[PDB]
Amino acid sequence: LNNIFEPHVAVRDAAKMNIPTVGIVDTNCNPCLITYPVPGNDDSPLAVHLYCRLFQTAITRAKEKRQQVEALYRLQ
């Protein structure tokens, strides 16, 4: 949601451009156009920090696993 509680225009734009969108949707959000909606609180600092940590860890794990797989294939 933007600062006027309407859905972010980026959601509609990404749907137009066929970009998959993960999204944290609160009770007042609109998960219709979000590819992978995660129903959760988006206002509490603890919840936002947990989401940031989770996505950071997922991306870092994915990148390091990609490096490991590429190195292992090179050593094959």
Partner RNA sequence: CCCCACUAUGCUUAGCCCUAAACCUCAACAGUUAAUCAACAAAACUGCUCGCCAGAACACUACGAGCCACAGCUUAAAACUCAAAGGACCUGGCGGUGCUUCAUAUCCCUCUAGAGGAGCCUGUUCUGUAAUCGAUAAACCCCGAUCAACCUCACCACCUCUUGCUCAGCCUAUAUACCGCCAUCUUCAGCAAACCCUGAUGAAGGCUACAAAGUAAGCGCAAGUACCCACGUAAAGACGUUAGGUCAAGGUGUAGCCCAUGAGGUGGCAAGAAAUGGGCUACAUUUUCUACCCCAGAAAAACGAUAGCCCUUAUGAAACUUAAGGGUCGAAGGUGGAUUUAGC
43 binds RNA (CB under 7 A): no
Give me the 14-33 binding string for RNA, x by CB under 7 A, dash otherwise. --x-----------------
Cα–Cα dist 71/64, whole Å: 10
Query: Which residue from 12, 44, 36, 15 is spatially nearest to 52, judged by alpha carbons?
Result: 44
With CB under 5 A as the contact rule, the residue among 4, 36, 43, 72 that binds Mg ion is 43
Q: C-beta of 22: minimal distance to RNA in Å?
A: 20
For 63, the token pair is 């990148």
48 binds Mg ion (CB under 5 A): no
With CB under 5 A as the contact rule, the residue among 8, 35, 42, 47 that binds Mg ion is 42
Answer whether 36's CB lies under 8 Å from 21's CB. yes
